[PDB]
Amino acid sequence: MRYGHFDDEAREYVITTPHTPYPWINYLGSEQFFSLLSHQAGGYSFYRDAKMRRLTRYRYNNIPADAGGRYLYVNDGGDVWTPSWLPVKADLDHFEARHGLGYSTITGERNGVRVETLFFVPVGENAEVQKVTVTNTSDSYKSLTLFSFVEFCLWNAQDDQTNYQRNLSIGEVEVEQESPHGSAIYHRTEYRERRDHYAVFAVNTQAEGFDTDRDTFVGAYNSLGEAAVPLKGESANSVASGWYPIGSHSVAVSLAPGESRELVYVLGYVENPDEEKWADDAKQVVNKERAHALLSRFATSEQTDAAFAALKDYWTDLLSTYSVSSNDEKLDRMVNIWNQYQCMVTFNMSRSASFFETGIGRGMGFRDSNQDLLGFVHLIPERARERIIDIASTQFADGSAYHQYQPLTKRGNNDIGSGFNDDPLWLIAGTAAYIKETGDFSILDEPVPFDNEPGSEVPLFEHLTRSFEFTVTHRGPHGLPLIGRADWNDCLNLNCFSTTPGESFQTIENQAGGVAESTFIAAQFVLYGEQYAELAARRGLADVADRARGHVAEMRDALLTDGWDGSWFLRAYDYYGNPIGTDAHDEGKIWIEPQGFAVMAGVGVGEGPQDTDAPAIKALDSVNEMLATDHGMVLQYPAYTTYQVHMGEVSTYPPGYKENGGIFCHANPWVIIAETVVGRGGRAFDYYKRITPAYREDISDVHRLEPYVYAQMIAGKEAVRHGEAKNSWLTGTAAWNFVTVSQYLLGVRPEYDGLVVDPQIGPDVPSFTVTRVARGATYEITVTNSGTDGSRGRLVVDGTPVEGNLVPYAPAGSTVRVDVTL
Amino acid sequence: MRYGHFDDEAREYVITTPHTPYPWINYLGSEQFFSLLSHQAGGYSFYRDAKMRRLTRYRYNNIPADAGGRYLYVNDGGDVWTPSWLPVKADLDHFEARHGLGYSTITGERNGVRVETLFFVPVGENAEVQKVTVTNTSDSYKSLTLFSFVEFCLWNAQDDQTNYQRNLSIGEVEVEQESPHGSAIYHRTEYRERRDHYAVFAVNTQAEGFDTDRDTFVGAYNSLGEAAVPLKGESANSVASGWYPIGSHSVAVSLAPGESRELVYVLGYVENPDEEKWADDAKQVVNKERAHALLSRFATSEQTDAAFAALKDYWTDLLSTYSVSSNDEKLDRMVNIWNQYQCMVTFNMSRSASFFETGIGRGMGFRDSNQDLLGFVHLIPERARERIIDIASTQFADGSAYHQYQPLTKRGNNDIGSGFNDDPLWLIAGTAAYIKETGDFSILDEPVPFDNEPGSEVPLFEHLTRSFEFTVTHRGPHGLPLIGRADWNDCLNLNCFSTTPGESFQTIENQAGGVAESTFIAAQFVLYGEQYAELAARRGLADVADRARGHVAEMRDALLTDGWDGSWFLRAYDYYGNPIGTDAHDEGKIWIEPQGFAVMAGVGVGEGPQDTDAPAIKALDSVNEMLATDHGMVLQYPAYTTYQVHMGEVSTYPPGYKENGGIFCHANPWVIIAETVVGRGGRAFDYYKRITPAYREDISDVHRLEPYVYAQMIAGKEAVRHGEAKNSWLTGTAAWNFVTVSQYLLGVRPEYDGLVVDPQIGPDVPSFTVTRVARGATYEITVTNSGTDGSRGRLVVDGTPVEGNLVPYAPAGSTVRVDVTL
Ligand SMILES: OC[C@H]1O[C@@H](O[C@H]2[C@H](O)[C@@H](O)[C@H](O)O[C@@H]2CO)[C@H](O)[C@@H](O)[C@@H]1O
Numbered sequence A, B: 001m002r003y004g005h006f007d008d009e010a011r012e013y014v015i016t017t018p019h020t021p022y023p024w025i026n027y028l029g030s031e032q033f034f035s036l037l038s039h040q041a042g043g044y045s046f047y048r049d050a051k052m053r054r055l056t057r058y059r060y061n062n063i064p065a066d067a068g069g070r071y072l073y074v075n076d077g078g079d080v081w082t083p084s085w086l087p088v089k090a091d092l093d094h095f096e097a098r099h100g101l102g103y104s105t106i107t108g109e110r111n112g113v114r115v116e117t118l119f120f121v122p123v124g125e126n127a128e129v130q131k132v133t134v135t136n137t138s139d140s141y142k143s144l145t146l147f148s149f150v151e152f153c154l155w156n157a158q159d160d161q162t163n164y165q166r167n168l169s170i171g172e173v174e175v176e177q178e179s180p181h182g183s184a185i186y187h188r189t190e191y192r193e194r195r196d197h198y199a200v201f202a203v204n205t206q207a208e209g210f211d212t213d214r215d216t217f218v219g220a221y222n223s224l225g226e227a228a229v230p231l232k233g234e235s236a237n238s239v240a241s242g243w244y245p246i247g248s249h250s251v252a253v254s255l256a257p258g259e260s261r262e263l264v265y266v267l268g269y270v271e272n273p274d275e276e277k278w279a280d281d282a283k284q285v286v287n288k289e290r291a292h293a294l295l296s297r298f299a300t301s302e303q304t305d306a307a308f309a310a311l312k313d314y315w316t317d318l319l320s321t322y323s324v325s326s327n328d329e330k331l332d333r334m335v336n337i338w339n340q341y342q343c344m345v346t347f348n349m350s351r352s353a354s355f356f357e358t359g360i361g362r363g364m365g366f367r368d369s370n371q372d373l374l375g376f377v378h379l380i381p382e383r384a385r386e387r388i389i390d391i392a393s394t395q396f397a398d399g400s401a402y403h404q405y406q407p408l409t410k411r412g413n414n415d416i417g418s419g420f421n422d423d424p425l426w427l428i429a430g431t432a433a434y435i436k437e438t439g440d441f442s443i444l445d446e447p448v449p450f451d452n453e454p455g456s457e458v459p460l461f462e463h464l465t466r467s468f469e470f471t472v473t474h475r476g477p478h479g480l481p482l483i484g485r486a487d488w489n490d491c492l493n494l495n496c497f498s499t500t501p502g503e504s505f506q507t508i509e510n511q512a513g514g515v516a517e518s519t520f521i522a523a524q525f526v527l528y529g530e531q532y533a534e535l536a537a538r539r540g541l542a543d544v545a546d547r548a549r550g551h552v553a554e555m556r557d558a559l560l561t562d563g564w565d566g567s568w569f570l571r572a573y574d575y576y577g578n579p580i581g582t583d584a585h586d587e588g589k590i591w592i593e594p595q596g597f598a599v600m601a602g603v604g605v606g607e608g609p610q611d612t613d614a615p616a617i618k619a620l621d622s623v624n625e626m627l628a629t630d631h632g633m634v635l636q637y638p639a640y641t642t643y644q645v646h647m648g649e650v651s652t653y654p655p656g657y658k659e660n661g662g663i664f665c666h667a668n669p670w671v672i673i674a675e676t677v678v679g680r681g682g683r684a685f686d687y688y689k690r691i692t693p694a695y696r697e698d699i700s701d702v703h704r705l706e707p708y709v710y711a712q713m714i715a716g717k718e719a720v721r722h723g724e725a726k727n728s729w730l731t732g733t734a735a736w737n738f739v740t741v742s743q744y745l746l747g748v749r750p751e752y753d754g755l756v757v758d759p760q761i762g763p764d765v766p767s768f769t770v771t772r773v774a775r776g777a778t779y780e781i782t783v784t785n786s787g788t789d790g791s792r793g794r795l796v797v798d799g800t801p802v803e804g805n806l807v808p809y810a811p812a813g814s815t816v817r818v819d820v821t822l
């Protein structure tokens, strides 16, 4: 199956039909106000946060899945149809949806009329802009009347979705048909309350009608695709007290054959200071200064078109700092465009919102973002520097770290689990990278506070220390670090033991005590121990850059003595000291995570890939023998047939699903560089094209999802719908896979002291040109691949031959030639 | 407008059409497993708790509102229609829905075929039973194939509704078409987990088909009313791994004209002990012992019909202990049947679940139930005695009381507000009543624990004490009690002061400090102070029955000195000591609550109703002048045009809505007995028929709701949709209105020492016969009304004339004649 294709030259994914398997969406807006739009126009919009400021209403778990998005109702002499197809689901002459960078296009054609919409949230404007181009393709005349639809969300998801007792009575909105530039509306529910803000919906034509109550608009005994006003041929011009409010404007267009009209809408998170909140001393009308302007800069096609480019350039500039030329377009589009893109949504989304994220329970994770930053520091160091400090601030003076944080209020959340003992080291992982990208040792000296509590601020370095030493303090009799609530994945909870339903495994209570340990953590800390022992050293804290350096080794050395199976690494030593993931169990002998993660860190790594006396090698050989799937590497194997009380949420999952014998994309990219690390270039790549969606276009139907995005969860060999990927769009895999090709496969990877060129792509890719902007200097890396396992590139920089993996950092505005053969 | 009528003789409300304004529902099941069914069959089912054990999926905020209930798909030679009309919304020949006591009937007729369903949850069976009677009314032959639908809810609402990341992968279910008695299914999602339970769906015929995945059943690009399998003429026999699972069974029926077939379904919260959980040592199949039986007792029409009666009798017995004979059927049906019924749903529902209650955030309230018990002690004292102890147990040794409690785990909840300073006295209000009903001073000596914490248990008396003295400790410079988070209604939060959105006013933080006081509380405590000073006295704690007695008076006396406006009672003294609800403000001078509640308690009450020098009188005169509406008495007046920072959630509401100038039914019945208390019988009644739905049948369209139920919130004079009632079905008004007629209007009201007959019904009702079962003896109260304001009844018990309002308690099996003229 296939439903579209990639148009690289245009930097976009094209879709043939609305009969996609599952709704495929794009993420609009990269700064403060993002919108989510299904190729069906289905989806919704929010400012900063969607838990709290959900501009508009979406309903998951819908029948059919996803009826309800931004819609245009069109009546052609009693004919009502929508190009979104949804909701009316009409017979279309032609249809197509193209995803873009910051935007998407929806175009629909029924009965001699063409409606095309441009969807985009443009830069600087906390508003989703829409540019319509209803064009008439008929010899005859078409005289149409157009209905625009939207369903506001009363600003708050948890309260809105779920709490109707207070909620149905607060829905007051204002109308202003005679607006300066056209005619609009202003959802202001709760504004009389503490709110000093609202949303604006408009069109740039004097609307000859409108509506602001849904039932009024659609009438009872009804569906969306059966909307009542669009069929009546005009608008009931409802006005709302209570219940659910929507925005609409009645518009008619008359167009000679081929004739056309342009219509621009403007949905905006409009907002005022408190003082100028009111147009009254009554305080009964909303200040509309800051919204008149809004719809004011977006009131022609010249401006809407003008904006379209602005961002195009925005992305267009944006992709430069890393790009590629090769034979494997499949590769190219994903690094170049679509993956570097998928990387971005995450920087901003954390894992808050997706179509699998109700984006209520989830703000931004400490762990998901620190790992998210890697994928992003190179997109925009400046923006990134802040996150480090925004995320670091959710740091306890304990060293212990807020599992996550509420995006909007920028404050810690205990809402979803607590006591995850690996978090603390993340800080170092993403952070240490900042500097590699920039050389900015400035951020260490920035002062970062503890828990957001003022007066506590310390240079960000203490946040690196605290977390480093959190482990050192917190480890088990094996010298192995403690798992607590969990290492990485939250499905491994040794200290839970629970038979009473109704309590999530992440909120559920965690029992005091243990001798319990994670080898996945120990692994990470052997990577990051050094991450900070060094940065601390360049600090001139030489005496404490060794202590730190030493604690890794006790730990380096205790991760082979005590976490080794002579074939693979132990998943963990559970609660009373017994192990987990030994060959000594029926189910779950091999767990992929210490495996990939302990080789990236370099543990048990020998002379070459030829040498098989290297635990590195034995360790990967096996995931190869055991975990590895054609679609990717299941988390561990085999999955469970019974509920391991002692472990936690892990076995709750049927076999083949998720953290239970499911392919956890995220876990996968960790192992690849292990292949590269190891020198098994050919293998890694095979892995990377394995869990990779560039190469996804093939069986769009196996996936049922977006062929352009790294989706956590592609179903397991054990499961019936294996090759079933869910939760696309918001997986650290976006950030961790870019990494690999960024830095380990295409081996263009930075350091504090120079740019390191070291490819390991297997023979599949024999030639490429990587251009990476570093420190202002462009590096043009033309490379010759011949594929020897354990082969390496020799560098010839600027015509002269050099030693190292390394290139000296070059003065800006300078352009530098690297040639490396391997 | 009107859409049905009352059929008293049958004890049921009948409906003509599915084109009701808003969905009208009934509550099935009175013990452990209740289901909610819209007359459209729309709704859902749960065991004990619906937050946690939602058997099946409902979606609020649906378009149209409420597509999705229990549905039967019928195909008549390629013709698919549903009698629920919903979801397919087809053209019906004839249609009708009758609500019942514990059940409802849905009957639909299209194209020469008749399908009638009986819906009921029967006694002892934690299952909703369905009895279908597809009958053919045609001269020709109809050969049909029938599809039954249901959409399971993965047991947990908060997790299910909102949390799709883990959720879509756990949906494993089992099928067994060849079941002993017919063919069925067993939603067992999470069962491999801590669950030791599940649900069973069946029919009693070998099903010639089935389905257990929704999309599979309906296919994509689809709605419910456009289900895909019902149209194909057979079932895809889906089986589910992950996603949303449903239950269906393919059934065909062939019937001569007038010929008919009977079909019984059985949806059940089936459950096992842990040990016998498994049919395997594999633990990969669900024990089905306890479910085979389930569908086993319900596998003929003889048993289904047999059960129908059992409960009919159940209610049928149930209404005896209080009933009436009069001219005002309008009155009769509500006391007798429909109100005493509405009373019951509440005992069980608290305010957890309604169609306005997502029934996730809300378990059972301390305050809503204590007040709920009043309405119910007489239905079933035994059941009631436990609640007192179940609810009392959510009592802090502080005296301070858990605002509410999680129904299922039976434990306190801080989820929704905390620090409500009136709660504590509720305990006395409902509890003291227990005894009046029964004489059971046993419950005081029951031992009730504190916070559910063992070892703390004390006779329930300390729970009466604690709460009594909680106030005494907690009062303001006026000697008035403190409001804290709130008195009664949660919209009056003096100590909040908040301009930052996103925090509910009940969870939001409450500021330490105050001189803030509620007069509504003070009022209550003057009613309950005595409630317990006496019970304590009959204890022989005479020395402490006076201290207690005294604290009322300081308080009786401080409620007129300090809470009086010479016209009405002060709503409260706010945070720095300034008052609220004085005639001294533009908005909100008169607040109905101290008014009704301070006259029920008897404060400022004079010689008669003629006397107008009585604050009682001035106080009600005014609510009459100010608050009183044709539809009922708005909470206070006038409502707000601006947000009183100091007050809290109160002004967030537009004028005319809810706790803001909205008719708060609940507040209303408090005042009536004030009229009765006062002697203004004629007025009270006028009030009671005023906010009363018996008399609701009139303009079914003003209400948009169930004409048989007390709905909190009927919109205000100030609001546009005034006469708009929302949130029907779960208002303490059900419990508090029964009270009034129970005890004050029809004046058949109990005490510790005898039965008190004292009507005050105004002249509208000149004659009645009340039969009330007390202490085993039936009391037949034939009464003669002539209506003098301040008139009273003289009693002639058993032919001989007596003095008092009082009748001596009569030895059981005895029947007693009361004649009273007034
Ligand atoms: O476990 C891997 C990754 O999962 C994230 O936790 C999720 C997880 O995705 C899901 O499979 C499980 O069912 O629910 C939890 C909810 O938190 C988490 O964000 C990461 O820390 C973790 O590494």
Ligand SMILES: OC[C@H]1O[C@@H](O[C@H]2[C@H](O)[C@@H](O)[C@H](O)O[C@@H]2CO)[C@H](O)[C@@H](O)[C@@H]1O
Binding pocket: A165, A166, B351, B365, B367, B368, B416, B488, B489, B490, B491, B506, B658, B659
């Ligand atoms: O306030 C009266 C009654 O209301 C209940 O609190 C509700 C209330 O119904 C609603 O109008 C407000 O918007 O929300 C709160 C949520 O708790 C409460 O159950 C009662 O205590 C109270 O007397």
